[PDB]
């Protein structure tokens, strides 16, 4: 179907404890494939998936070069942001940046992304047009003016429409055995008596990939949205993910409840009941 590549970047200042820590990771869909940490003994872009390991020394050198330069730029940017917000040099601050691309089944750009946050809040973002900017406040407007002057959007558009898509397609082919394999969830319902009057029904989805999934409980065919406890999808640590949905049901009424499972790894959405 559709696929994504994302690069995430976080710099965190720590005055009195050296330079801001820089950590960046790259993903294709929900698969981590590269990482760089400025606190590593010998900081370099490192492989994190089998299919990227085949890339040659030139690849790893260029990626490492880019990471080191980004860490430097982030540190200058953090200093700039202190000025823009009239802030002290004493405090710790956070600068985040994500960029990347989505491709469709035809393999052409579906959407491009490039956005920044300072201290957990949206700062500036490249719009979906890949030509204009949304600035969150008067500080970010200064950045917008600079980036409009330097035609930054045009440079990002060229990358997002070109190399981003082209290299994403390369990775999808090289990692096809895993990146293009959907693992359906293993599913079951468990029963956990709470009292004489009520029991929890917990619907499980285990060992699935990619992370996207829908788990819903119905009572008499009515969606139990307000009454369902849904945990955040969580990593198992083996590439796969886990999730559960739970409802509290009156004892004896368990058969009025059905769990519904949707995942791209399944031909048809599943319907599950508790089986005593």
């Amino acid at each position: 179907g559709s696929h994504s590549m994302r690069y995430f970047h976080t710099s965190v200042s720590r005055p009195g404890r050296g330079e801001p820590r820089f950590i960046t990771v790259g993903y294709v869909d929900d698969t981590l494939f590269v990482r760089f940490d400025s606190d590593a003994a010998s900081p370099r872009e490192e492989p994190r998936a089998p299919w990227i390991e085949q890339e040659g020394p030139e690849y790893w050198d260029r990626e490492t070069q880019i990471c080191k330069a980004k860490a430097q730029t982030d540190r200058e940017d953090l200093r700039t942001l202190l000025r823009y917000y009239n802030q002290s040099e004493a405090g710790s601050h956070t600068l985040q940046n994500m960029y990347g691309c989505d491709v469709g089944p035809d393999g052409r750009l579906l959407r491009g992304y490039h956005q920044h946050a300072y201290d957990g809040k949206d700062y500036i973002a490249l719009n979906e047009d890949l030509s204009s900017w949304t600035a969150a406040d008067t500080a970010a407007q200064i950045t917008q003016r600079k980036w409009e002057a330097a035609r930054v959007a045009e440079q990002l558009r060229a990358y997002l429409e070109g190399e981003c898509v082209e290299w994403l397609r390369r990775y999808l082919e090289n990692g096809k055995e895993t990146l293009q394999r959907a693992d359906p969830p293993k599913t079951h319902v468990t029963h956990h008596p709470i009292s004489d009057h009520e029991a929890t029904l917990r619907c499980w989805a285990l060992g699935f990939y990619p992370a996207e999934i829908t788990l819903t409980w119905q009572r008499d065919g009515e969606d139990q949205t307000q009454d369902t406890e849904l945990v955040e999808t969580r990593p198992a640590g083996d590439r796969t993910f886990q999730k559960w949905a739970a409802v509290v049901v009156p004892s004896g009424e368990e058969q009025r409840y059905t769990c519904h499972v949707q995942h791209e790894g399944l031909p048809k959405p599943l319907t599950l009941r508790w089986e005593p």
């Binding site: 790259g26 070069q65 880019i66 330069a69 700039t80 500036i124 600079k146 930054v152 990002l156 190399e163």
Partner: peptide, 9 residues
């Protein structure tokens, strides 16, 4: 593959 950043905030 990454984009080389050539701009500042």
């Amino acid at each position: 593959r990454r984009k080389w950043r050539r701009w500042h905030l």
